[PDB]
Design an enzyme around this catalytic site. Sequence first.
Site, PDB file in Angstrom:
ATOM      1  N   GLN B  35      23.081 -15.332 -80.093  1.00  0.00           N
ATOM      2  CA  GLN B  35      22.319 -16.571 -80.242  1.00  0.00           C
ATOM      3  C   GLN B  35      22.635 -17.174 -81.602  1.00  0.00           C
ATOM      4  OE1 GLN B  35      19.039 -13.214 -80.941  1.00  0.00           O
ATOM      5  NE2 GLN B  35      18.228 -15.063 -79.931  1.00  0.00           N
ATOM      6  N   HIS B  66       1.261 -13.393 -83.963  1.00  0.00           N
ATOM      7  CA  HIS B  66       1.486 -11.950 -83.922  1.00  0.00           C
ATOM      8  C   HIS B  66       0.162 -11.216 -83.735  1.00  0.00           C
ATOM      9  CE1 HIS B  66       5.316 -13.391 -85.733  1.00  0.00           C
ATOM     10  NE2 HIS B  66       5.742 -12.587 -84.716  1.00  0.00           N
ATOM     11  N   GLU B  90      11.914 -10.321 -86.221  1.00  0.00           N
ATOM     12  CA  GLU B  90      11.504 -10.523 -87.612  1.00  0.00           C
ATOM     13  C   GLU B  90      10.573  -9.425 -88.145  1.00  0.00           C
ATOM     14  OE1 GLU B  90       9.868 -11.703 -84.938  1.00  0.00           O
ATOM     15  OE2 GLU B  90       9.678 -13.884 -85.461  1.00  0.00           O
ATOM     16  N   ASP B 110      15.440  -4.457 -80.616  1.00  0.00           N
ATOM     17  CA  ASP B 110      15.935  -5.828 -80.533  1.00  0.00           C
ATOM     18  C   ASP B 110      17.430  -5.797 -80.253  1.00  0.00           C
ATOM     19  OD1 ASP B 110      16.892  -8.611 -81.368  1.00  0.00           O
ATOM     20  OD2 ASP B 110      14.700  -8.780 -81.798  1.00  0.00           O
ATOM     21  N   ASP B 142      19.933  -3.880 -76.103  1.00  0.00           N
ATOM     22  CA  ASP B 142      19.303  -4.600 -75.011  1.00  0.00           C
ATOM     23  C   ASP B 142      18.086  -3.813 -74.527  1.00  0.00           C
ATOM     24  OD1 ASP B 142      18.582  -5.956 -72.603  1.00  0.00           O
ATOM     25  OD2 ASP B 142      20.663  -6.356 -72.093  1.00  0.00           O
ATOM     26  N   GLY B 143      16.911  -4.469 -74.493  1.00  0.00           N
ATOM     27  CA  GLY B 143      15.697  -3.800 -74.088  1.00  0.00           C
ATOM     28  C   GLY B 143      15.762  -3.319 -72.630  1.00  0.00           C
ATOM     29  N   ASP B 163       7.924  -9.013 -77.105  1.00  0.00           N
ATOM     30  CA  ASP B 163       7.996 -10.136 -78.028  1.00  0.00           C
ATOM     31  C   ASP B 163       9.403 -10.731 -77.958  1.00  0.00           C
ATOM     32  OD1 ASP B 163       7.628 -12.091 -79.960  1.00  0.00           O
ATOM     33  OD2 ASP B 163       7.551 -10.611 -81.686  1.00  0.00           O
TER      34      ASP B 163
HETATM   35  C1  LIG Z   1      12.335 -13.264 -82.978  1.00  0.00           C
HETATM   36  S1  LIG Z   1      11.309 -12.591 -81.709  1.00  0.00           S
HETATM   37  C2  LIG Z   1      12.330 -12.699 -80.260  1.00  0.00           C
HETATM   38  C3  LIG Z   1      13.388 -11.548 -80.275  1.00  0.00           C
HETATM   39  O1  LIG Z   1      13.807 -11.103 -78.964  1.00  0.00           O
HETATM   40  C4  LIG Z   1      15.165 -10.699 -79.057  1.00  0.00           C
HETATM   41  N1  LIG Z   1      15.696 -10.491 -77.713  1.00  0.00           N
HETATM   42  C5  LIG Z   1      16.083 -11.399 -76.783  1.00  0.00           C
HETATM   43  N2  LIG Z   1      16.488 -10.823 -75.625  1.00  0.00           N
HETATM   44  C6  LIG Z   1      16.387  -9.494 -75.812  1.00  0.00           C
HETATM   45  C7  LIG Z   1      16.698  -8.301 -74.977  1.00  0.00           C
HETATM   46  N3  LIG Z   1      17.239  -8.425 -73.700  1.00  0.00           N
HETATM   47  N4  LIG Z   1      16.431  -7.115 -75.550  1.00  0.00           N
HETATM   48  C8  LIG Z   1      15.925  -6.969 -76.801  1.00  0.00           C
HETATM   49  N5  LIG Z   1      15.647  -8.007 -77.654  1.00  0.00           N
HETATM   50  C9  LIG Z   1      15.873  -9.271 -77.187  1.00  0.00           C
HETATM   51  C10 LIG Z   1      15.822 -11.792 -79.822  1.00  0.00           C
HETATM   52  O2  LIG Z   1      16.949 -11.199 -80.480  1.00  0.00           O
HETATM   53  C11 LIG Z   1      14.708 -12.067 -80.827  1.00  0.00           C
HETATM   54  O3  LIG Z   1      14.912 -11.335 -82.011  1.00  0.00           O
HETATM   55  N1  LIG Z   2       9.284 -22.687 -80.381  1.00  0.00           N
HETATM   56  C1  LIG Z   2       9.091 -21.839 -79.380  1.00  0.00           C
HETATM   57  N2  LIG Z   2       9.020 -22.267 -78.136  1.00  0.00           N
HETATM   58  N3  LIG Z   2       9.037 -20.545 -79.626  1.00  0.00           N
HETATM   59  C2  LIG Z   2       8.992 -19.513 -78.627  1.00  0.00           C
HETATM   60  C3  LIG Z   2       8.207 -18.398 -79.270  1.00  0.00           C
HETATM   61  C4  LIG Z   2       9.036 -17.184 -79.584  1.00  0.00           C
HETATM   62  C5  LIG Z   2       8.601 -15.976 -78.776  1.00  0.00           C
HETATM   63  N4  LIG Z   2       8.837 -14.720 -79.499  1.00  0.00           N
HETATM   64  C6  LIG Z   2       9.143 -14.860 -80.926  1.00  0.00           C
HETATM   65  C7  LIG Z   2       7.932 -14.713 -81.831  1.00  0.00           C
HETATM   66  C8  LIG Z   2       8.251 -14.020 -83.116  1.00  0.00           C
HETATM   67  N5  LIG Z   2       7.991 -12.580 -83.211  1.00  0.00           N
END
Ligand SMILES: CSC[C@H]1O[C@@H](n2cnc3c(N)ncnc32)[C@H](O)[C@@H]1O
Ligand SMILES: N=C(N)NCCCCNCCCN
EC number: 2.5.1.16
Lengths: 286, 288, 288, 286
Positions: B35, B66, B90, B110, B142-143, B163
């Site tokens: 990304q 959060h 983050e 993440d 990858d989760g 999240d």
């Molecule tokens: C910032 S909070 C959202 C987080 O989800 C993460 N994210 C997106 N898709 C996946 C996935 N398939 N597995 C783990 N983390 C992910 C993104 O890298 C981002 O850091």
């Molecule tokens: N502008 C938006 N539509 N944001 C989507 C929110 C992000 C969801 N997880 C990330 C939250 C950080 N831990």
Amino acid sequence: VPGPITLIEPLSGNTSLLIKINAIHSVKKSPYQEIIIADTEDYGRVLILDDYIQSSYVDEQYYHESLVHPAMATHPNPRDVLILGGGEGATLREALKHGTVKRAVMVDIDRDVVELSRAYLPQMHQGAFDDPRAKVVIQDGFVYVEEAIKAGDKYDVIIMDLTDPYSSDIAKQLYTREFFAKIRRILNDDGVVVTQAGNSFYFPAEYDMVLEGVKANFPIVAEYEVWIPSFGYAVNFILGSLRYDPHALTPSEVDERLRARGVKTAFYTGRVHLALMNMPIHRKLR
Amino acid sequence: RKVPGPITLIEPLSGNTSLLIKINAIHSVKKSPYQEIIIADTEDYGRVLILDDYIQSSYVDEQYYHESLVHPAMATHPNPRDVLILGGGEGATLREALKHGTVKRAVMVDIDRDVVELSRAYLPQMHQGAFDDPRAKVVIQDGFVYVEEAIKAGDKYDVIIMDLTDPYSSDIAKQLYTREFFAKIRRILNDDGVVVTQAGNSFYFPAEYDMVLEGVKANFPIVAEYEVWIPSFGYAVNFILGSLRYDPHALTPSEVDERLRARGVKTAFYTGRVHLALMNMPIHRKLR
Amino acid sequence: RKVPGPITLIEPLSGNTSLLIKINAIHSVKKSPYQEIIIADTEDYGRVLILDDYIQSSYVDEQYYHESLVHPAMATHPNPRDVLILGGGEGATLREALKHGTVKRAVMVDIDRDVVELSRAYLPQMHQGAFDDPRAKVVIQDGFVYVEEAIKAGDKYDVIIMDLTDPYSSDIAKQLYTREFFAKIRRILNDDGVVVTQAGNSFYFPAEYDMVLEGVKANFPIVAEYEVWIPSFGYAVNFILGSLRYDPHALTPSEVDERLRARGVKTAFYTGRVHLALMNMPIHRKLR
Amino acid sequence: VPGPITLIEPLSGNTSLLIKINAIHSVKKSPYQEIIIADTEDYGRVLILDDYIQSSYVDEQYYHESLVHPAMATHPNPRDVLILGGGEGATLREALKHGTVKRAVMVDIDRDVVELSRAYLPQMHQGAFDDPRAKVVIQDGFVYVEEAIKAGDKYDVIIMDLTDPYSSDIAKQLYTREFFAKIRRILNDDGVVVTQAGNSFYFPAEYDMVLEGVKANFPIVAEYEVWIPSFGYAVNFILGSLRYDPHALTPSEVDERLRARGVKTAFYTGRVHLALMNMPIHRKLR
Ligand SMILES: CSC[C@H]1O[C@@H](n2cnc3c(N)ncnc32)[C@H](O)[C@@H]1O
Ligand SMILES: N=C(N)NCCCCNCCCN
Ligand SMILES: CSC[C@H]1O[C@@H](n2cnc3c(N)ncnc32)[C@H](O)[C@@H]1O
Ligand SMILES: CSC[C@H]1O[C@@H](n2cnc3c(N)ncnc32)[C@H](O)[C@@H]1O
Ligand SMILES: CSC[C@H]1O[C@@H](n2cnc3c(N)ncnc32)[C@H](O)[C@@H]1O
Ligand SMILES: N=C(N)NCCCCNCCCN
Ligand SMILES: N=C(N)NCCCCNCCCN
Ligand SMILES: N=C(N)NCCCCNCCCN
């Protein structure tokens, strides 16, 4: 992505919304403000005053139900209602749903808003303007209230549905400590007032001014907010009461009053009232 | 200003609505394999992490997000000892979960090491050290793969917090929002476990919200839906909490406050009364 | 992308039209005593200097602007030895003027030391070392005061180039665009001297353009008007060349090319044929 | 600042224009494209197709006079003129001003554009659609030209006034090397073609494709540009000629031919022609 035709709706000065427009129904420079009625893709039809969406078809019920029903339901028997502002007629519509209401007066400064709403926003007023219990007065609400004090008029519930306290020149005198002292003079001993107060997150100083004005004049003050997608933020409401505490209502008592008074809503219920009474308002946290 | 500027972020919202947000500085732009990542200072919201144009977190309002994501689920569970977080790059979700004194082990997974590393470098008020807490483990993966490996290994958690990037916009997260994924999540929970996820926004993205909801309901007998306005996102984020035994609706304000006190949890927002409001406020839908 | 982004500069154009320009990086933001300064990378135009929201110069198109401002005037003068530049803070005007082998002395006067210093540091392809040419002198001062002092000292120039912020938007430059200022300029020119200024844009700001033109015409017997499209500005910049003796309209393409050759001037754009086109193309005005 | 209602006009993908809108007269999703007719503050009334202003009241004469008159003036006696595109009718209007013209055919694929122009853009067509010398044909210009080759039709001047070669799916086949070979087959032996070719600064690859197409097919090729404020850039034109060189035409011969043919213009003159013939086109320089 929004376009090709777009409304730029101001929010804070440092944030604005870009909203796709499908049609423009009417543009009118009135003596008081610029009025546009438009169709938006996300929110359906909207009334815009000086660039700010005042109401949209898809979310106006969140705003008008939140403004009107907590106050009206708190009052055990609201018979005389005054609305300042509310030019599209949706506030009047919600207040008239209370079967206890015998007389509802709506005072807006701008005849052009009322007339364009009549013509282009039928789903807002839904005929409220012609209800035999209603009276629509075109006048500055400040003058109207001064005249009400002179005549010794009294109301059970006063609802202020004005343009924003952080942006609006025409509404500015109605948000002062002195105005709220006047409002108290035209309430019954057990009356309630409710007003929208802008947004405490983006405009904390102007919100705090409204709050301090209500608190100077009313012993019971409740603060609550509701997200209105079309505005870009959670509108803050301030409810001032002379006797009845909205915090003391159970969900079941709220539902009982709505049922007894024949009020149907898309949003407000006893559980919504409980949530409104328990949710702290947003502030910038850092 | 009617048009914030001169430098502005255009944050997508619905496709028919976007936010224009004044920018004061850009600290980092990184095209990762997964990304586009920007760290920037905004006038209204302070520092932000942006992924593919969407603010994920801002200094001035991230605690609303959060605390809302984490504490209802953690407080519902009478004794959360093992916590899994998917996403949360983050580190703020981890930070909130670690505040619960009952937690013995927290794993955060993440997919994108660049997000974790830029947070480490530029977002100290987000993680607040959480990445290096001895209770915490950060796994870059990858989760989806992580959970499949957890099932094979027979791993079990008390609370799983998702999240992730949004279900309506994010290709990388899309497999984690399915009915089948939630069946996998249930396989790595204890018998009294709870899951919580953000599910986008029911007002602007009702179909995608409904898909996530249907998926949770297929897999969990207790499902609570709640939302909180996050100014920097432009909308009220929807959360869905799925539970195997304990009902968040049954908790009084004073039970919530008692558990937070016992566990040493300090918050800027979440309290027992907030819990009650979250449990009683219906979610927004387009009404016409 | 229909809306460039995610990070975007909103550059004002007329008040009723603005440009949205994608930004890749912000190198420097400085609120100086005179104006807000940003140095940034844009996707379309490369690096830019921005003053109060207006791009003053971009890597990919600045040569169109600077060559158009400088070479018609310098080529018209048969022997420009002493050159004064008012404004020109990034140093590109100075760069173009110094290319003329006849030039023995070039003074550049800008009111804002922060612009000169940030250009020195962040816009090397603009100045290309011009600031340190032994023929050059850089003076930090209001051009208005500088010219008053030049009159007192009896200083004289062959060519005066005004490279200021716009007459329709700029408070700091406003006194330099008056009938009275052009009378002062004439007092510091040799008997056969030439002045050239940019004059905003006659299409979007006709009243302000007309005021500058009438001010030049009051003071100079020969006046040429020409414009060139500068993509990064969103419009064709108007230039006004005032001359005491030599007529730019009388120059053939061959004579222009010969003078450029003899003086060792290399350009990316300006040639004798460009000069002929500039002298024959009427300026744009709103037609209805 | 532009607003509250704004058009976002795409330019390069990395630059767009934000243009204040005063009114929207018509929105029509045709089978071929989205059409809007609107009033802008800076440019007056505009026709917009898929988000791009095709023409504005205040600057369209710069575009249409530049497209039409260099080609028509270069031809010593243009009697038969074919226009591909030109749906608002302004290209037709300019070509008909030449007294030598006996027959002018305009072929646009999209009946809705012609009809909305008829209704809302009188200052564009100025009656041109109903001139006895004019014929309006609704058809893909690709098919029309194939049919013209089969019938052995011939023209003196062919003017292509299409949607952009860098953005437009409907016009894409008309910009190819093969299409220009077809155009040559429906010209007289001394005929001339002219087309707009997008913008060489922002879209150099697509410009170069059109240029190579014309050069493959015509021994004389002139390139020139003119700044059109409402588009956000200098439109590039490419003129292809079988015999007469536009470079050889003097200001005084241009003025003489315009006078003799009764052509009145707001912009184009012999001196403009000289400038167009001598000004190199813009390219990114770094
Ligand atoms: C910032 S909070 C959202 C987080 O989800 C993460 N994210 C997106 N898709 C996946 C996935 N398939 N597995 C783990 N983390 C992910 C993104 O890298 C981002 O850091
Ligand atoms: N502008 C938006 N539509 N944001 C989507 C929110 C992000 C969801 N997880 C990330 C939250 C950080 N831990
Ligand atoms: C649309 S809801 C807001 C309304 O407040 C009305 N308004 C603004 N200021 C005043 C005022 N001073 N008195 C009465 N109504 C007002 C406006 O005319 C608008 O219709
Ligand atoms: C970047 S080219 C325009 C330059 O004009 C300079 N400028 C503006 N007003 C004045 C003035 N009154 N005297 C000298 N320079 C000026 C500005 O500082 C800017 O660097
Ligand atoms: C408004 S000028 C551009 C015109 O070109 C027309 N156009 C686009 N593609 C074609 C095509 N393939 N044949 C004929 N006309 C076209 C469009 O309908 C438009 O009206
Ligand atoms: N977009 C905004 N900032 N909107 C504020 C509008 C609220 C004023 N009452 C108008 C609603 C009428 N019932
Ligand atoms: N509207 C605009 N973007 N105008 C900027 C014009 C540049 C005037 N100063 C000279 C530029 C630097 N040499
Ligand atoms: N990007 C743009 N705005 N371009 C529009 C160019 C118009 C092409 N033919 C139509 C001209 C009208 N006769």
